[PDB]
Write an enzyme that holds these catalytic residues in place. Structure first.
Site, short mmCIF file in Angstrom:
data_model
loop_
_atom_site.label_atom_id
_atom_site.label_comp_id
_atom_site.label_asym_id
_atom_site.label_seq_id
_atom_site.Cartn_x
_atom_site.Cartn_y
_atom_site.Cartn_z
N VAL A 1 5.45 -0.80 2.65
CA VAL A 1 4.70 -1.04 3.51
C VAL A 1 3.26 -1.81 3.23
CG1 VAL A 1 2.08 0.74 4.92
CG2 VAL A 1 4.44 1.55 4.77
N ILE B 1 0.86 -1.72 -0.38
CA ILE B 1 0.07 0.36 0.20
C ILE B 1 0.71 1.60 -0.09
CG2 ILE B 1 -1.83 -1.45 0.94
CD1 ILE B 1 -1.33 -0.16 3.92
N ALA C 1 5.29 2.73 -0.34
CA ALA C 1 6.84 2.25 -0.94
C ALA C 1 7.86 3.19 -1.32
CB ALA C 1 6.54 1.07 -2.59
N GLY C 2 9.20 2.75 -0.56
CA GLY C 2 9.62 3.67 -0.46
C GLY C 2 11.17 2.88 -0.91
N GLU C 3 12.97 4.22 -1.20
CA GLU C 3 13.77 3.32 -1.69
C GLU C 3 14.24 2.06 -0.75
N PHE C 4 14.02 1.99 1.11
CA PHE C 4 14.33 1.28 2.08
C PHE C 4 13.77 0.11 2.42
N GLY C 5 12.42 0.93 2.05
CA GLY C 5 10.97 -0.67 2.14
C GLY C 5 9.79 -0.51 2.19
N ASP D 1 3.62 9.69 11.25
CA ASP D 1 4.47 9.89 11.00
C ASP D 1 5.21 10.91 11.96
OD1 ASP D 1 6.59 11.25 9.06
OD2 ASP D 1 5.21 13.04 9.16
N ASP E 1 5.72 18.06 10.77
CA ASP E 1 5.08 17.98 9.22
C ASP E 1 4.00 16.75 9.03
OD1 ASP E 1 5.19 17.21 7.15
OD2 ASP E 1 6.44 15.01 6.79
N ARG F 1 -1.64 14.79 3.65
CA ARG F 1 -0.41 13.93 3.78
C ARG F 1 -0.31 12.81 4.99
NH1 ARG F 1 3.47 16.63 4.24
NH2 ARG F 1 5.53 16.17 3.88
N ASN F 2 -0.42 13.27 5.99
CA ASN F 2 0.24 12.20 7.35
C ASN F 2 -0.79 12.33 8.32
OD1 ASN F 2 2.56 12.58 6.17
ND2 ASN F 2 3.62 14.37 6.61
N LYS G 1 5.00 -1.87 8.24
CA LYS G 1 5.81 -0.66 7.18
C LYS G 1 7.02 -1.70 7.78
CE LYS G 1 6.50 3.29 8.17
NZ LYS G 1 6.38 4.76 8.06
O1 LIG Z 1 1.16 3.92 7.89
C1 LIG Z 1 0.56 3.39 8.92
N1 LIG Z 1 1.33 2.78 9.25
C2 LIG Z 1 2.22 3.51 10.44
C3 LIG Z 1 2.74 4.10 10.49
C4 LIG Z 1 3.96 4.87 10.69
C5 LIG Z 1 4.65 4.10 11.39
C6 LIG Z 1 4.70 2.17 10.70
C7 LIG Z 1 3.11 1.71 10.17
CL1 LIG Z 1 3.07 0.43 9.45
C8 LIG Z 1 -0.77 3.20 8.07
C9 LIG Z 1 -1.93 2.87 8.23
N2 LIG Z 1 -3.23 2.74 7.46
C10 LIG Z 1 -2.89 2.74 6.82
C11 LIG Z 1 -3.80 3.11 4.95
C12 LIG Z 1 -2.97 3.70 4.33
C13 LIG Z 1 -1.32 4.34 4.55
C14 LIG Z 1 -0.79 4.57 3.35
C15 LIG Z 1 0.62 4.62 3.06
C16 LIG Z 1 1.20 4.90 0.92
N3 LIG Z 1 0.72 6.79 1.72
C17 LIG Z 1 -0.66 6.68 1.88
C18 LIG Z 1 -1.16 5.87 3.25
C19 LIG Z 1 -0.83 3.69 6.02
N4 LIG Z 1 -1.15 2.85 6.73
#
Ligand SMILES: O=C(Nc1ccccc1Cl)c1cnc2ccc(C3CCNCC3)cn12
Length: 266
Positions: free
Chosen positions: A23, A15, A17-21, A147, A129, A133-134, A36
């Site tokens: 989600v 759902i 993605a980045g350079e280092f891993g 974030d 930040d 988006r966060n 993540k």
């Molecule tokens: O990031 C999430 N959890 C998270 C937060 C901080 C550190 C590690 C983790 Cl696993 C998260 C949770 N539900 C969603 C649902 C969607 C997304 C997308 C990721 C890519 N950009 C749009 C949101 C992220 N998430």
């Protein structure tokens, strides 16, 4: 933080993605989770920042702050496991759902974000930040700040057009600079994810703000809401509301919802 054994976790769909891993959406044993990962060969700094995010999140317990389930640190790739937010990032969500919510729902989203930010500020955490988006959104329309860490740099020196003047000009990030950012988030939410300042360059935005210009009223925006976001954008930090003030004001508006029928002139 809770150490989770990998046999308890299945990754299903990428759902993010980045350079280092990446989600993922996955399951935790059975409940949906976000996952993540950190790729092999990570540096010391990468590890400290990655596990640092989990460590920060694990210190918090609030309805409007993303909840940590735990980490996989003893096995590789390392993982952070959180609740899964079914509607994803607030910015993208608003832009895909333009016009689909009531004013009261939008204001409710902002109260939730403000409550999370009050909690962070009171916990001595400066986000730096804060932007749509966060923020993540669940299937109850609950908005949660995400974030976390200390892994960040201001663009051209974290986007300029979300950042308070003092943070740009002399690197002073405080809860009051987060309030500025919250004002921007308010405008994002009430506009269904319009980009602040449209096509103005970063330098045009800074010049405009320094000359007294501010974002105009969103369409169909309650007067009280526009007044509140304008106060978040006071040049002088000490004139900005605290999150405690913002929560209080939004709560009163929500509990007397007719107050939101009075609209700022567009
Ligand atoms: O990031 C999430 N959890 C998270 C937060 C901080 C550190 C590690 C983790 Cl696993 C998260 C949770 N539900 C969603 C649902 C969607 C997304 C997308 C990721 C890519 N950009 C749009 C949101 C992220 N998430």
């Amino acid at each position: 933080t809770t150490e989770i054994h990998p046999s308890c976790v299945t990754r299903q769909k990428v759902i993010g993605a980045g350079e280092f891993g990446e989600v993922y959406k996955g399951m935790l044993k059975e409940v949906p989770v976000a996952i993540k990962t950190l790729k092999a060969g990570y540096t010391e700094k990468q590890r400290v920042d990655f596990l640092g995010e989990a460590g920060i999140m694990g210190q918090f317990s609030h309805h409007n702050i993303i909840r940590l389930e735990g980490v996989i640190s003893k096995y590789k790739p390392m993982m952070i496991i959180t609740e899964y937010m079914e509607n994803g990032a607030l910015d993208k969500f608003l832009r895909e759902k333009d016009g689909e919510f009531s004013v009261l729902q939008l204001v409710g989203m902002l109260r939730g974000i403000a409550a999370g930010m009050k909690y962070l500020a009171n916990m001595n955490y400066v986000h730096r930040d804060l932007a749509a988006r966060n923020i993540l959104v669940n299937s109850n329309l609950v908005c949660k700040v995400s974030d976390f860490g200390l892994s960040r740099v201001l663009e051209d020196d974290i986007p300029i057009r979300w950042t308070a003047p003092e943070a740009i000009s002399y690197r002073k990030f405080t809860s009051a600079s987060d309030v500025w950012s919250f004002g921007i988030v308010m405008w994002e939410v009430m506009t269904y994810g319009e980009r602040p300042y449209w096509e103005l360059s970063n330098h045009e935005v800074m010049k405009a703000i320094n000359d007294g210009f501010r974002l105009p009223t969103p369409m169909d925006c309650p007067s009280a809401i526009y007044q509140l976001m304008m106060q978040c954008w006071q040049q002088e930090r000490a004139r900005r509301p605290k999150f405690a003030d913002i929560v209080s004001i939004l709560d009163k508006l929500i509990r007397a919802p007719d107050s939101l029928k009075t609209l700022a002139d567009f």
